């Protein structure tokens, strides 16, 4: 069955976390990690992000009715925080 994982990523020097996103309310699909860049922040945090993970919470925010572009905005905005850390709750099988 599915389970949740809390993933905390700090972006690299170029402001990148190292993963690709698909999905959003306008895409008729959940938010899904479509690619992990090997050895990037998303690939080397503990626990690490995985391809196929479904993102359900972004820095405490429920994203179930947000568009792809709105979600991308939320992720980039994590880089302006006090620590500039992205905290994802994802769902995995």
């Amino acid at each position: 069955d599915s389970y949740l994982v809390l993933i905390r990523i700090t972006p690299d020097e170029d402001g990148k976390f190292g993963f690709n996103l698909k999905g959003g309310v306008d895409q008729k699909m959940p938010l899904v990690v479509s690619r992990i860049n090997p050895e990037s922040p998303a690939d080397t945090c503990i626990p690490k992000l995985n391809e196929g993970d479904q993102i359900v919470l972004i820095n405490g925010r429920d994203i179930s009715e947000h568009t792809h572009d709105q979600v991308v905005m939320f992720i980039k905005a994590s880089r302006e925080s006090h620590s500039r850390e992205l905290a994802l709750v994802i769902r995995r099988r």
Partner: peptide, 11 residues
Amino acid sequence: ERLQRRRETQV
């Protein structure tokens, strides 16, 4: 009913 090509974004 219909489905456009889905966007993918690198972050």
